[PDB]
Design a binder for this molecule. Structure first.
Ligand SMILES: *[C@@H]1O[C@H](CO)[C@@H](O[C@@H]2O[C@H](CO)[C@@H](O[C@@H]3O[C@H](CO)[C@@H](O)[C@H](O)[C@@H]3O)[C@H](O)[C@H]2NC(C)=O)[C@H](O)[C@H]1NC(C)=O
Ligand SMILES: *[C@@H]1O[C@H](CO)[C@@H](O[C@@H]2O[C@H](CO)[C@@H](O)[C@H](O)[C@H]2NC(C)=O)[C@H](O)[C@H]1NC(C)=O
Ligand SMILES: *[C@@H]1O[C@H](CO)[C@@H](O)[C@H](O)[C@H]1NC(C)=O
Ligand SMILES: *[C@@H]1O[C@H](CO)[C@@H](O)[C@H](O)[C@H]1NC(C)=O
Ligand SMILES: *[C@@H]1O[C@H](CO)[C@@H](O)[C@H](O)[C@H]1NC(C)=O
Ligand SMILES: *[C@@H]1O[C@H](CO)[C@@H](O)[C@H](O)[C@H]1NC(C)=O
Lengths: 107, 171, 49, 171, 171
């Protein structure tokens, strides 16, 4: 006579995953659902990125001289750097956050 | 799993089977052989993909949102902004943990299921001409050459042909 | 270079459902979670011998 | 499904069976017949209802809440109100999508289950007097008239009565 | 459950079995006996614990948050603080209700599964030497003393030994 065997495959290197009943259990393959890394660069496409360089958005708005390059500019995303500084008459904006927001949003 | 086939009554997997997820090994007069079952392999892969595509699907696009970091202590409103963001993150972190747990449990169970379904399909084909050896192998009580084994694998096996022989050898 | 998702850390790929990079994002972005990893099983229980 | 009965080893459904979800078709000396199995039909319907009632249940009553539309640009606080509402809607949208996917998967699986359970129950009744033809039909190796078929259906079949006859005809 | 063993083809449970979750009761020439199956009992307990540990696990630590009660009517911001907290509570209340429903459904199904798996394992051991009586009892067609029953229970039963006797008595 003959013998017929039913079987399933297996692999040398398996992967531990987590289930309802099981904290670690080995399967043949798994895929990662959490992105943990970055290339490190803000990609200039496909969004119009405006690098503010030494300028904050508010100074660009007001017209601080060293910001005058930003006149009439547009952006999808305005990037403010930490090195930014104000060179003009010292001022303050009550509810600075809101002006910043609504201008940033107007774009 | 839940059907008790994989890591079940089937002792272990075959690292040697590289052309499919599920298959047959046989031994008969002519020698030993191995072949993958592509339909059930496909069933498993299809399901897993379906689910993979459910989850890996397009993310949500968001543009202007609330501020999530603060350089000054402001009290109440910042307390609220912070609390809202923290709440959101906790809830999604929960959804994700659970999605993975459920999904994985189910994948394990469905792959077990496919195995068991192949076994069952085969047993049913063989009718009275074979016995379940409990290890996931059938004992075939008639003379089965490579063509015959093949006929079992592609689903064309005619049991009535060998029934007399097999019946004879079983008892 | 190109990418649909921007974070203060840099751009990140949006192919995955979730990300640990930053709670601050712009564009089409994985939802942000506290875990640095969640593995979704793509095959059966592995049983070597 | 997960048991491989429906869309399984059972080729297809019967559009002709309008009095129940699961049943028997038979062919014997006297002719052909069809009858619904009401207990297992009920099992399925009951579960599906239980679930339907879990979901369709009373909604939540809310009265005065935050404002969700705005005619003026206000900045920070409006950003926050908007963000909170948007966050909530995304989270519930997720719960709903998932509830439906899970629930549906499970309904498919549980109806498959009921079918397979009926099959198994019946096979067990028949003992040595019939064989599994693999298509969801049993071959009964003794003489079974409409009363006998009935006895199988209402669970009163006594196998010992026909065992000799059947055993004889099987081998 | 989903396998139709517990509250299934197995009529009811044994309040008399206090040393395990699943076991055997036997009757042979020497008398009647009862013994627990510790492996499958363990399988069930282990899973249930795994799950219990998933849920009962460390809670989240939070310290300074938004205020959730108010002694004065303030309008907009309070509306918002109130709405945020209410939103959070409704979502977590949902998560908890569902967690429990799913988890429980699954526990019921997995304990049913374990039972059915033990049954299947045993049937496979016995080969041609016994028949499924449908009530979760096997009829053993040869002479089985307490040692033999034991051998069935600890998985060492050699069917080939009794096959001739049993085959004889079956037909
Ligand atoms: C992407 O960007 C964020 C923000 O820049 C990075 O998070 C920062 O990571 C560092 C290193 O893990 C954290 O340092 C820690 O600070 C805590 C709190 O003061 C301190 O107790 C620890 O000893 C440690 O030094 C830092 O807190 C954290 N910053 C924030 C605001 O979260 C993140 O690491 C970056 N991820 C990638 C992929 O580059
Ligand atoms: C941003 O501001 C910095 C600092 O003021 C500028 O760096 C100066 O550059 C000039 C011209 O190259 C040098 O002579 C100075 O030595 C730099 N100053 C300091 C303090 O480092 C920089 O030019 C500005 N960047 C842009 C694009 O406007
Ligand atoms: C692991 O799974 C991923 C996603 O399904 C797939 O792209 C990859 O090919 C798999 N790896 C192997 C070796 O099967
Ligand atoms: C199955 O195998 C037999 C013998 O090898 C062959 O003749 C037949 O064509 C096959 N059937 C199918 C549908 O592939
Ligand atoms: C089952 O069928 C038999 C014969 O038709 C009938 O005599 C008997 O009463 C039925 N049993 C039940 C419980 O309905
Ligand atoms: C099973 O039972 C037999 C007879 O009682 C005994 O000899 C044997 O050692 C047992 N096997 C194991 C592995 O416990």
């Amino acid at each position: 006579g003959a013998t017929l065997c039913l079987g399933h495959h297996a692999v040398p290197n398996g992967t531990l995953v987590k289930t309802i009943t099981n904290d670690q259990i080995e399967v043949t393959n798994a895929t990662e659902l959490v992105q943990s890394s970055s290339t490190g660069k803000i990609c200039n496409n496909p969004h119009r990125i405006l690098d503010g360089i030494n300028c904050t958005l508010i100074d660009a708005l007001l017209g601080d001289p060293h910001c005058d390059g930003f006149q009439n500019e547009k952006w999808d995303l305005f990037v403010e750097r930490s090195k930014a500084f104000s060179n003009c008459y010292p001022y303050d904006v009550p509810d600075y956050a809101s002006l910043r927001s609504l201008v940033a949003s107007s774009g | 799993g839940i059907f008790g086939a994989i890591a079940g009554f089937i002792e272990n997997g075959w690292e040697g089977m590289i052309d499919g997820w599920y298959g047959f090994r046989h031994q008969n007069s002519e020698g030993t052989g191995q072949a993958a079952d592509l339909k059930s392999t496909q069933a498993a892969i299809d399901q897993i993909n379906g689910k993979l595509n459910r989850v890996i699907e397009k993310t949500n696009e968001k543009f202007h949102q609330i501020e999530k970091e603060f350089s000054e202590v402001e009290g109440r409103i910042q307390d609220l902004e912070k609390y809202v963001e923290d709440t959101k993150i906790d809830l999604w972190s929960y959804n994700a943990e659970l999605l993975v747990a459920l999904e994985n449990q189910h994948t394990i169970d469905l792959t077990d299921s496919e195995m068991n379904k192949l076994f069952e399909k085969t047993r049913r084909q063989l009718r009275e001409n074979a016995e379940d050896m409990g290890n996931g192998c059938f004992k075939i009580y008639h003379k089965c050459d490579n063509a015959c084994i093949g006929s079992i694998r592609n689903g064309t096996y005619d049991h009535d042909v060998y029934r007399d022989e097999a019946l004879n050898n079983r008892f | 270079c190109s990418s649909e998702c921007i974070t203060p850390n840099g751009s990140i790929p949006n192919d995955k459902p979730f990300q640990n990079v930053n709670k601050i994002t712009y564009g089409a972005c994985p939802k942000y979670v506290k875990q640095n990893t969640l593995k979704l099983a793509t095959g059966m229980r592995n049983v070597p011998e």
